[PDB]
């Protein structure tokens, strides 16, 4: 039902429930100075009504920050009872971000 788009060719397909779960947690973990990164990434959803967000336009620094923000959200979620049901998709997302050519 949606995805996290990393770059044009690299995506993490998700269900609607996974999409909502992820964007909400990741969204809470941005630093004040990095809010513009969130706005850029969340644009397809917030501006366009789409069930995806996208890091395709970020430079190496922006994406590095996004990945750090994702890992913070993942940590903050470990506490939650639901966590094992979502762990595989956190792992998919962190992995594809790590593998992104900009982080090479």
């Amino acid at each position: 039902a949606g995805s996290i788009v990393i770059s044009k060719e690299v995506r993490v397909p998700v269900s609607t429930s996974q999409f909502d779960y992820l964007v909400s947690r990741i969204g809470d973990q941005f630093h004040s100075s990095d809010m513009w990164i969130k706005d850029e990434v969340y644009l397809p959803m917030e501006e366009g009504g789409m069930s995806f967000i996208s890091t395709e336009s970020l430079n190496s620094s922006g994406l590095s920050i996004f990945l750090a923000t994702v890992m913070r959200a993942r940590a903050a979620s470990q506490a939650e009872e639901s966590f094992p049901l979502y762990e595989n998709v956190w792992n998919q997302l962190v992995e594809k971000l790590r593998q992104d050519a900009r982080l090479g």
């Binding site: 044009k8 501006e47 069930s51």
Partner: protein, 116 residues
């Protein structure tokens, strides 16, 4: 919920049986719990929850088309059905969507359902 909930209800009239939200942590959205498609999986897209959202989708559909279509193919490959509640799309965007769908591999096109 309401967009997908409405879409599932309509889909039940054409695919039979009952459509249940998949369990938490599923990679699909809904699963048929009875009928001739019992057991088959369903991923929805383009099922806006509000009038405002449908307007947003319409205004920037062209800008988001490529990512939307790539996400669509991913889900068509993985699920048995990918229904789109496309009634709310402008005629301009319906033309864009139908044309884009026709360039996907035929095995994926057969999986995509336009809720009329």
């Amino acid at each position: 919920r309401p967009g997908e909930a409405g879409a599932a209800a309509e889909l039940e009239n054409y695919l039979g049986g009952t459509l249940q939200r998949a369990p938490q942590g599923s990679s699909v959205d809904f699963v048929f719990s009875s009928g001739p498609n019992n057991g088959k999986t369903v991923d929805f897209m383009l099922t806006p929850d509000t009038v405002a959202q449908a307007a947003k989708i319409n205004q920037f559909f062209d800008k988001n088309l490529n990512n939307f279509m790539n996400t669509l193919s991913d889900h068509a490959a993985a699920a048995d059905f990918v229904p789109l509640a496309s009634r709310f799309l402008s005629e301009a965007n319906k033309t864009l969507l139908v044309k884009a769908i026709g360039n996907l591999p035929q095995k994926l096109q057969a999986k995509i359902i336009l809720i009329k």
